[PDB]
Amino acid sequence: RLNTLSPAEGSKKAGKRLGRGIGSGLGKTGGRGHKGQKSRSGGGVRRGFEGGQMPLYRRLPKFGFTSRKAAI
């Protein structure tokens, strides 16, 4: 019955393949748009970067402290 086993419907999606033909849908950079940082290989901005504006986690003050008794 090895040639009869099948997976449950919806268990697989086959993944998305980028830049393979016209009718595959997402070709031509595979759904990352035109020029920019996102279009380049290895591009993107680090976490919390706001385009040079001061990040929220830097604008807000830090407060409180860690209690060791709470850990034990």
Can you give the binding site for other proteins, defined by CB under 8 A?
Answer: 22-23, 27-28
Are 45 and 37 contacting, i.e. CB atoms less than 8 angstroms apart? yes
Residue keyed to tokens 């919806």? 10
Minimum CB separation of residue 30 from other proteins in Å reads 13
CB 53, min distance to other proteins, A: 35
Q: Is residue 19 within 8 Å of residue 31, measured between CB atoms?
A: no
Closer residue to other proteins (CB): 28 or 40: 28
Q: Considering beta carbons, is residue 22 or 70 the nearer one to other proteins?
A: 22
